[PDB]
């Protein structure tokens, strides 16, 4: 049997190796790549459908209320007003982060919030516009599980304002594309992301670095530039690439869609893109947005990933599974 | 030795080799985040809201 | 927005101005800092 086991192992090894060579040769043609992608899309069609997450109950509900109030207020606010609101809210968030004593008193749970409103108004009623102060008082009125959730809600409202002005201009697609490109480049260079994520370094210096190095280029969307500058400035021990990924995810989620970091071997034909979007939307219920990565080792197929679920169709993964099946 | 059976073993193995992609859930070692509906680790090595370095972890289901 | 020493005064005023709730411990009752459901 030991001779039999050795014979099986060796024969399987040779067969799998030369089969891998055969696959590498056959898929090398772009038409073969497209055929594999189409087969995977058909399989996904055959596949059956499915069946603010770091926030506690009180903070979840309070942020929901603040977001709804912002949507109510900003429905009639214009692009310049939106930019002013976003800048003001970013400034207020920086103020809270710097002045911890003020933050704790503004974010302490209470049954009557009148003292909070009095503090806010007697503090900065005139320094900021009416909409900014209205949102701030709505935010402090509610109950936050942790005092940090207050700053989170403030920066979230500011981000929503910037995404709203993006919508008003019409560059939602372009701003989301810029955000995802920025996230990819930050991921590819962990050293820069580590440098920017350090809050202990002055925030303004980091904003200047991002402007002069990455965000300042002829082909950078203004909204994406401002939004990343805001996020990097108001950073609290959060890795920069994670922050920009959250930015892009929120930007898409405003439209009800979801990020699908599809990775392919080559750019998908527009018909393939529509097919993929449709199939993924029907699988996961709500519509989705497809973001393409290109990696030669995939040898065709698609390695889809949404949230926490991965559908690994790469031919390389299939080959590896073949090489792990030999007795 | 009856080499026919030795060849036939691998013939059976390769035939009916269905590695059809299956929707799977993965997490990442954090110091294991993810796996909301919860495990294998690379090399065959085998619980609150926040978590259950950086390597991918697959649940055996 | 500008941070100025006046805010250090403002907080004091707030503290001067300020029924309990069973958090799990009771919050409120100003008359540790966090606490002394529903």
């Amino acid at each position: 049997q030991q001779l039999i086991r050795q014979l099986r192992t060796g024969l399987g090894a040779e067969a799998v190796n030369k089969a891998a060579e055969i696959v590498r040769a056959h898929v090398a043609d772009p038409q073969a790549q497209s055929a594999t992608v189409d087969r995977f899309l058909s399989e996904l069609e055959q596949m059956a459908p499915s069946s603010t997450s770091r926030l506690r109950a009180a903070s979840r509900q309070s942020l929901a209320a603040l977001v709804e109030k912002f949507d109510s207020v900003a429905g009639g606010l214009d692009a310049d007003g939106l930019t002013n609101l976003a800048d003001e809210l970013a400034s207020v968030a920086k103020l809270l982060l710097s002045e911890t004593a003020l933050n704790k008193h503004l974010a302490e749970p209470t049954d009557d919030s009148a003292p909070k409103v009095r503090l806010l108004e007697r503090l900065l009623s005139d320094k900021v516009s009416a909409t900014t102060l209205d949102l701030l008082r709505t935010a402090v009125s509610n109950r936050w599980s942790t005092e940090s959730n207050l700053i989170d809600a403030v920066e979230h409202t500011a981000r929503l304002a910037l995404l709203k002005r993006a919508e008003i201009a019409g560059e939602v697609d372009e701003v989301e594309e810029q955000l995802f490109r920025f996230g990819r480049v930050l991921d590819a260079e962990p050293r820069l992301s580590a440098l920017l994520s350090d809050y202990t370094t002055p925030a303004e210096g980091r904003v200047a670095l991002l402007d002069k190095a990455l965000t300042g280029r002829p082909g950078v969307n203004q909204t994406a530039a401002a939004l990343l500058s805001q996020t990097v400035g108001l950073l609290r021990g959060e890795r920069a690439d994670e922050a920009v990924i959250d930015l892009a995810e929120l930007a898409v989620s405003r439209r009800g869609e979801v990020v699908a970091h599809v990775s392919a071997a080559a750019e998908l034909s527009d018909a393939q893109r529509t097919r993929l979007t449709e199939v993924l939307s029907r699988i996961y219920g709500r519509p989705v947005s497809v973001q393409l990565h290109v990696d030669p080792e995939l040898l065709g197929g698609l390695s889809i990933t949404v949230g926490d679920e991965v559908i690994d169709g790469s031919i390389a993964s299939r080959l590896a599974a073949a090489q792990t099946g030999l007795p | 030795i009856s080499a026919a059976d030795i060849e036939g073993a691998i013939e059976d193995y390769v035939s009916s080799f269905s590695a059809d992609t299956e929707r799977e859930e993965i997490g990442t070692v954090i110091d294991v985040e993810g796996l909301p509906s919860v495990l294998e680790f690379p090399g065959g090595v085998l619980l609150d809201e926040h978590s259950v370095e950086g390597q991918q972890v697959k649940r055996t289901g | 927005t500008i941070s100025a020493a006046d805010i250090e005064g403002a907080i004091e005023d707030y503290v001067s101005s300020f029924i309990g709730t069973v958090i799990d411990h009771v919050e409120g009752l100003p008359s540790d800092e966090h606490s002394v459901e529903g």
């Binding site: 109950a57 009180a58 599980s145 | 909301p36 919860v38 619980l47 609150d48 | 799990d24 459901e37 529903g38």
Partner: peptide, 29 residues
């Protein structure tokens, strides 16, 4: 109704509950 959070802590709607924050003592079931 409530859902499991930790494994056993159970989150519940605000007024239909005791660790506080509506909690008591597979995820999301």
């Amino acid at each position: 109704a409530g859902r499991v959070v930790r494994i056993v802590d159970v989150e519940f709607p605000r007024g239909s509950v005791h660790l506080g924050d509506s909690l008591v003592r597979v995820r999301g079931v």
